Amino acid sequence: MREVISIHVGQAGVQIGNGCWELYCLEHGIQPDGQLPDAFNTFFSETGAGKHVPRAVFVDLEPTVVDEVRTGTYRQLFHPEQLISGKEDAANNYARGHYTVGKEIIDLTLDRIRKLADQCTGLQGFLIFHSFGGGTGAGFGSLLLERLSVDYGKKSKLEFTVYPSPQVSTAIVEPYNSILATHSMIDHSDCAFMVDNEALYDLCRRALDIERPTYTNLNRLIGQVVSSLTASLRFDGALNVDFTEFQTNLVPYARIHFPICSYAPVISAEKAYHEQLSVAEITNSLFEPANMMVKCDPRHGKYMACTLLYRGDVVPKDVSAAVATIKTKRTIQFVDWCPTGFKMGINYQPPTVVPGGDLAKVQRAVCMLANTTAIAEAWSRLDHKFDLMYAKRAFVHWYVGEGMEEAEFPEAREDLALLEKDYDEVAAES
């Protein structure tokens, strides 16, 4: 009746794809063969008998990550044409993943996403996942959004990407790809979320009690956040939030859109039995810098808008009291030309657990997505790192040889400076 389409790019995108859809099928009850032992039609299509199919497309430029899905347990659920794999990856090169290898497969994918759009009578929105440091995630991700911008126009293109960590890095060429991909993000993305791996590691150890995690555990934390966001579209609630509502309330400016994410309560299955976890308790926990999924302190900056999403036995009165109590704090700063600053959404379906899981059977939870000026701290670190490498021309030969003109390097640097100015200009007060 109302549909959103999921697009996954890169190794992170495919690995996140398994992490989220394992929850969707389990939350809805679908056997991994597609049978049953509702909101089914928001995420799935029916093929007769009792067999369902997810509304998603997985794309990567190398077959290893995708073939795990093809050989995995969940192979029967997905449609063969949705899983698209290239021949050779971009090798952490934006230029390779945008012009040379990206254009070899772009038009094949655009048929499958558009063909999937035929079966959506009430399509409203896309979801796109990246890893900024990767080549296919940035190089091919930029080419995908530019086409989807003109193919469909005024359709919500929400993004949920993995920003580079403030210090943790797995690729040396990481600063180059992030800035170049940022230029493609700002003009085409309706709204793009941030998480970073370094903060997730700390949260997966402190609040949730695991000595040593893997990317699989981090993928399940991200899966919870996406579920809470989409719960309003799928399940009944006193206060539903559609995608188009979420676009207007959060972003104050065309280019300031970038929000940040948090989830509460995050607590081990052992210790979660120890507390009542009232609405006031969970609401307070979100606003601490320690719980943030992005390693930037909000106290350095200010808040521009906030959105709170509740999933459980959560009553409207105690939400308003809890949000009222937050405004009493004078460590939570707001730009005084933003007087209201909040949208609350309420859904009745409680959070769903997973076998072999890492969270508990909590009875009520809260999700938060807000825009803050503290993200200019993250942009500054990337900006300085890029300048040091570009001053001595540390890696230019690889990018130019792969079709990219060198004139794009100062353009992306200049465009980021405008974005930094926009955040500082918004931070001004009258």
């Binding site: 065309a254 308003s320 030309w337 007087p339 209201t340």
Partner: protein, 427 residues
């Protein structure tokens, strides 16, 4: 034979409408499948006001449900009364609401306008008489604030004589459900001032306070919060549906309470309200009822009357009661608190009596008043709007729909002048 047509707009409107139809259906005694199994001949006297009869002993409400996204409608279908409504009266779009007034008014509002109007024409021109229409919507939203006002202008153009009574929910001052509310509220009020005859304002914060401090509900859900709204909306039309010692329909209310065409915004309040454990000890009488109505804590709108002055007041009573006792309290409440009434209008309290009370209550009363305390409500939105309007970027969401920035200035100027108009009639 004074038929009234019912219109529900948006997520807020549909959920309010759903509970309200439960209340009347119980009152007349109509089963959720639509057939009468009541208990008295009186309930069939004037059921024609709200129900049409589909031959077969089935009654169909005179309701139209309007939304931009199908999510709200399907919840209504799954309810116990989903099958009651006529299927063709469900009019919905296939696009996101947007939570934006300009997009709701111009982008999706135009397309839905012609389809909805012909559905209204089917219900409007199906009855021997038509007193007026009845709209329920929210002002902080995008569909109810945007598309609701668009239909209100077209309804005025085609049916000037009929009473366009509206029930509105006003954005809350402390914590509110939407960020862009100052734009949505300001642009909507300009449309409401010139079009609707009667507008009732309700704030969600007061319902939280009344349910918690008075009704003693620890966890008041929207079901009980909407339940309070339904009693007031049922009480106003009670005179049409039932006999009484002194009748008073909508047009009597507008004539008496509205001294000038633009001062017609009202507050509402309902009595008696008692804790469902403490109800036994209350000696509920006529004087006890009057205490609750004029008490400032029972106002469903968060605008303390004591900070302003009253212009006109109206009281509705239901049940078998003394006419002398009812008339005496209007004297006493007016004389004891003369500091809170305008001197240049004597007899500021209107009264009416109805025979038949709601279920469970032997007697009940309803209050509607007009006061200058609404300057508090409009001050909050105007000051908040002024902060937001200097931050010009939020307007860009409205510019991408085609709204010209001068419309923001026109809306605020009309709204600002309305506050000044209430100031001068305080003197």
């Amino acid at each position: 034979v004074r038929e009234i047509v019912h219109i529900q707009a948006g997520q807020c409107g549909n959920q309010i409408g759903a509970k309200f139809w439960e209340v009347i259906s119980d009152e007349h005694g109509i089963d959720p499948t639509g057939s009468y199994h009541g208990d008295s001949d009186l309930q069939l006297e004037r059921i024609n006001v709200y129900y049409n009869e589909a031959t077969g002993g089935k009654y169909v409400p005179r309701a139209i449900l309007v939304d931009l996204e199908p999510g709200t409608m399907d919840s209504v279908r799954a309810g116990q009364f989903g099958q009651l409504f006529r299927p063709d009266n469900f009019v919905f779009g296939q696009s996101g609401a947007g939570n934006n007034w300009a997009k709701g008014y111009y982008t999706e509002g135009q397309e839905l306008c012609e389809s909805i109007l012909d559905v209204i024409r089917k219900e409007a021109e199906s009855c021997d008489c038509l007193q007026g229409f009845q709209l329920v919507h929210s002002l902080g939203g995008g569909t109810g604030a945007g598309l609701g006002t668009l239909l209100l202008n077209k309804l005025r153009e085609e049916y000037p004589d009929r009473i366009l009574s509206t029930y509105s929910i006003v954005p809350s001052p402390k914590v509110s459900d939407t960020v862009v509310e100052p734009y949505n509220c300001t642009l909507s009020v300009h449309q409401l001032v010139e079009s609707a005859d009667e507008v009732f304002c309700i704030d969600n914060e007061a319902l939280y306070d009344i349910c918690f401090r008075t009704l003693k509900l620890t966890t008041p859900t929207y079901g009980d919060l909407n339940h309070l709204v339904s009693m007031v909306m049922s009480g106003t039309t009670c005179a049409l549906r039932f006999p009484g010692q002194l009748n008073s329909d909508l047009r009597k209310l507008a004539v008496n309470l509205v001294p000038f065409p633009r001062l017609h915004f009202f507050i509402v309040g309902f009595a008696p309200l008692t804790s469902r454990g403490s109800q036994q000890y209350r000696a509920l009488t006529v004087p006890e009822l009057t205490s609750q109505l004029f008490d400032n804590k029972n106002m469903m709108a968060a605008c303390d009357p004591r900070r302003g002055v009253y212009l006109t007041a109206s009281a509705h009573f239901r049940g078998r009661m003394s006419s002398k006792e009812v008339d005496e309290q209007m004297l006493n409440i007016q004389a004891r608190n003369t500091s809170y009434f305008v001197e240049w209008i004597p007899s500021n309290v209107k009264s009416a009596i109805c025979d038949i009370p709601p279920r469970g209550l032997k007697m009940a009363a309803t209050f509607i008043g007009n006061t200058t305390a609404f300057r508090e409500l409009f001050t909050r939105v105007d000051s908040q709007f002024q902060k937001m309007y200097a931050r010009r970027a939020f307007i860009h969401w409205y510019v991408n729909e085609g709204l010209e920035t001068v419309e923001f200035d026109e809306a605020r100027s009309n709204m600002t002048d309305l506050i000044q108009e209430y100031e001068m009639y305080e003197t």
